[PDB]
């Protein structure tokens, strides 16, 4: 386990033949209101475009997933709600340890008028159609939100 | 766009204040048979455990997503089938450009008796329950497969 780089959002290390990227864990929040899902978009230099995602972000030191979820939702959209843990997933276990904890948010209320991040309320059916037509791209969190909705929220 | 490392499965670069990890695109295959989903497990040094995933892998030079999907399915499980493109997603757009193309596989047939990789046929409902109980972890591909099944394959 040798480190070739210790950065801000990640560290690059080696374990023999394997290249490993250590990354802070993350959270994502699925929120539905009047049939529309709460998506967000922002410039992502790593991909060169703005995919459709859901409120998400890194878990800061001292925070547990639930607290981080509350914060990301408030900071990115200015909303608060009753959160319920759903499940988690490793974004790409073949090279990184980033683990994402997904929550469901209900009974949304605005806690701050002042939420870089574009808030995009959109019916999940519409998001899926636009993607199938090649009009928009998805981040893992956005796709998970869309699939979760079709599976358990209709 | 400065490079601090050019490796095998990834490159580490910088774009001002952003740390970017360039990674080859990938594919994942969702397959259902007799109510069981085709999951796979393998040691993943980056995470320290073996999460529940679905057949997946990198797209090699010269290959398009469909061809890569056929190959990963055959090499990891020894099966072949009729593949249909479903959708794609960026695993973690906040730091990497890895994009995953997901396919559905139907009418499975064994093409090789000789498929590191553990083949795990399991009902998606069971996979979800075990995860909720904290008995198993999910990779993004495994979770996407489970959610896709609950949304459109029942
Ligand atoms: Zn931070
Ligand atoms: Zn290769």
Question: Using a CB-CB distance cutoff of 8 angstroms, which residues of chain B are in contact with residue A89?
Answer: 51, 137-140, 142-143
Q: Does A9 touch chain B (CB under 8 A)?
A: yes
- Cβ separation B92–A87 shorter than 8 A: no
**Ligand with an atom nearest the CA of residue A62:** 1
CA distance A118 to A27: 18
Convert B67-126 into a string of H (helix), E (strand) and C (coil): HHHHHHHHHHHCEEEEEEEEEEEECCCCCECCEEEEEEEEEEEECCCCCCCEEEEECHHH
Q: Which CATH architecture has domain B1-154?
A: Alpha-Beta Complex (3.90)
- Which of A4, A9, A16, A19 is best to mutate for the B interface (most B CBs within 10 A)? A19
Question: Does residue A134 sit at the B interface (CB-CB below 8 Å)?
Answer: no
Q: Which ligand lies nearest the alpha carbon of B58?
A: 2
> How do B99-110 and B26-33 pair as beta strands?
parallel
**What is the distance in A from the centroid of ligand 2 to the CA of A22?**
22
B23, B96 contact by CB (below 8 A)? yes
Q: Closest approach of chain A CAs to the CA of B106, in angstroms?
A: 20
CA A106 to CA A138: how far, in whole Å? Answer: 23
Query: Residue B154: CB partners within 8 Å, gap ≥ 6?
Result: none
Determine the distance in angstroms separating the CA of A113 from the nearest CA of chain B, rounded to an integer. 25
Residues A43 and A26: their CA atoms lie apart, in Å, by 18
C-alpha A63/C-alpha B79 separation (Å) is: 44
Enumerate residues 70 to 109 of chain A having a beta carbon within 8 A of any beta carbon in chain B. Answer: 87-100
Nearest to B89 by CA among A117, A53, A97: A53
- The closest of B87, B84, B97, B102 to B139, measured between CA atoms, is B102
Give B42's strand partners.
Answer: none
- The helix/strand/coil state of B62 is coil
The residue extents of the domains of chain A are 1-154
Q: Does B2 touch chain A (CB under 8 A)?
A: no
- Rounded to an integer, what distance in angstroms lies between the CA atom of residue B90 and that of residue A51? 8
CB-facing half-sphere around the CA of A75: CA atoms within 13 A: 11
A147 inside 8 A of chain B by CB: yes
With an 8 Å Cβ cutoff, is A46 touching chain B?
Answer: yes
Please report which ligand is nearest the Cα atom of A26. 1
């Amino acid at each position: 386990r040798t480190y070739l780089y210790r950065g801000r959002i990640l560290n690059l290390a080696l374990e023999g033949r394997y290249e490993i990227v250590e990354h802070k864990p993350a959270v994502a929040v699925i929120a539905l209101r009047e049939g529309r899902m709460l998506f967000v978009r922002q410039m992502r230099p790593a991909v060169g475009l703005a995919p459709l995602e859901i409120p998400a972000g890194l878990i800061e030191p001292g925070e547990d997933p639930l607290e981080a979820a509350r914060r990301q939702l408030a900071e990115e959209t200015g909303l608060s709600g009753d959160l319920t843990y759903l499940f988690s997933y490793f974004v790409s276990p073949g090279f990184t340890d980033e683990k994402t904890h997904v929550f469901l948010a209900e009974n949304l209320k605005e806690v701050e008028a002042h939420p870089a991040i574009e808030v995009v309320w959109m019916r999940p059916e519409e998001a899926l159609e636009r993607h199938q037509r090649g009009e928009v791209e998805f981040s893992a969190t956005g796709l998970v939100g869309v699939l979760y909705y079709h599976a358990f929220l209709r």
